[PDB]
Design a protein around this nucleic acid. Sequence first.
DNA 1: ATGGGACTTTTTGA
DNA 2: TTCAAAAAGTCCCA
Length: 546
Amino acid sequence: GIYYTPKIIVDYIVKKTLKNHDIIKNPYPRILDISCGCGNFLLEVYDILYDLFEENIYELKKKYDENYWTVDNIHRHILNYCIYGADIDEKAISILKDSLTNKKVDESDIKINLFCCDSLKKKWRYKFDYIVGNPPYIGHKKLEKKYKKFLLEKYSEVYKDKADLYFCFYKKIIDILKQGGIGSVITPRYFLESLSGKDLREYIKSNVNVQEIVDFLGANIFKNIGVSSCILTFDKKKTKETYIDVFKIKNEDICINKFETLEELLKSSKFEHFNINQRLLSDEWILVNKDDETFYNKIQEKCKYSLEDIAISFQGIITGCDKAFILSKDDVKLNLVDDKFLKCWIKSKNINKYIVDKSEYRLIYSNDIDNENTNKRILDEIIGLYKTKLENRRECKSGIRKWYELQWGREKLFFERKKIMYPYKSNENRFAIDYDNNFSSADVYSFFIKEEYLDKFSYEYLVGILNSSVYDKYFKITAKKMSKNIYDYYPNKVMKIRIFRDNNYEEIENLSKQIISILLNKSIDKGKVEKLQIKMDNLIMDSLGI
DNA sequence: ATGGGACTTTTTGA
DNA sequence: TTCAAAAAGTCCCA
Ligand SMILES: OC[C@H]1O[C@@H](n2cnc3c(NCCCc4ccccc4)ncnc32)[C@H](O)[C@@H]1O
Ligand SMILES: [K+]
Ligand SMILES: [K+]
């Protein structure tokens, strides 16, 4: 339903927009929260406004109607002309209306600008000086399909495919912000790097000046909520400089109440600060300090190939109901399944650097079951146990897929070959050579080398550089940060990784072969692997001139 | 009970 | 026909 923003963040966002407002020049500022809820932001806006008017009451009295500008009239003026809110939930609006009314503690029917409505559909009849708040976050699975049709038709500039509802709130906030106005919101951080956020990033960069980005990375800002947050402050002021302040957290384990204010935390050693030229932003926003930019640019300039140039990428199997098709390799039910139907099956946790654990699970590649009479035992006793849920998959409702078939069985011959596999979400680079024809779900991605690039790049060389500390840091510069100690390792970024080939190729490959050989023996002395990795990292840093 | 850690399905638009 | 993206993740315990 409704999510509670921490008070320290609310106060920071309100101060960000109002701390330098010239109330003498403009005593009628319009401040709007478009998903105000119970008024976490708007009630704080009231307090800031009240002090602002009271500190300058005599100056306003002298400059303007001296009967209008009294301390006793500040409450009425704020509610009539300054505070605006919208929310879909009428109970929240009712509570906020009482809270705003009780700030005074009837005289005559004071009107409060609170709208119970869908903020994305409301005919907004004027623009606003300042916009603050915390919009709803709803992804592609959890957003109602009927509503998505409206968003795709009307918010197509920021919303396509797997985009999120809060993209549209960025759009609406920008569109109804007054010229010279200031907006400050807390949203998920994912749009900063995600493929879905590309159009939204283009919309922001070309319509507002981004003053500041506070990136909390994987820190837990909302207690008991699995989301990662950032704060964006932007304006429509005519400026020539357009440089962004970026505050990036250093330690994700920090608790947000370290000081009384967020400014103390931002200026502390817990955060790093650097500046980014908004004019230099491409479709991607590479937000790193100068040392990392130099590091990243050296590697990009030195590497003449990308993984996409040399490799074929694919996502793993999607059965659509794992419990129906995935069995423990020691399950007695597998005696019913001819081994021609059985594939080795691994999870993301089975991928280490350079090699995969031995599989403990088997997939029934049910697409190869010819019909329901020749293998009735498998259908009745294993797969049919989940027949109702299997029939509710989209391709079964439409008749594209039989009820016992895998939803997305892919191509078997893609998996039954030497290939490289990596987990879809990890704390570090973990690229392994698969020797055992392992299948996997979508928590593991795979690629193999194009035949015309085999004489330039071997699998052993590739897992060598890809698992190095250099490439771990290099990938994480632009990688999508998901939660604490987790990055997405998806092809839309993994395949952009650039690779090189030079005089160190042979020794890097040989070091990788030694690592693999040690990792695969029984009396495993894991320690020497670390020494070999350090030597390989030195060769790689020498190659890339870092 | 909360807060922190290990781990990751299938729905969905294109 | 069939690809790949998506954390207001999910679930557990001390
Ligand atoms: O969570 C943050 C706050 O945000 C409010 N809020 C959500 N969503 C809209 C909204 N429009 C989008 C509607 C999306 C939708 C479509 C179908 C069914 C259910 C939701 N407009 C104004 N406040 C909103 C919530 O009430 C809450 O207080
Ligand atoms: K006057
Ligand atoms: K988080």
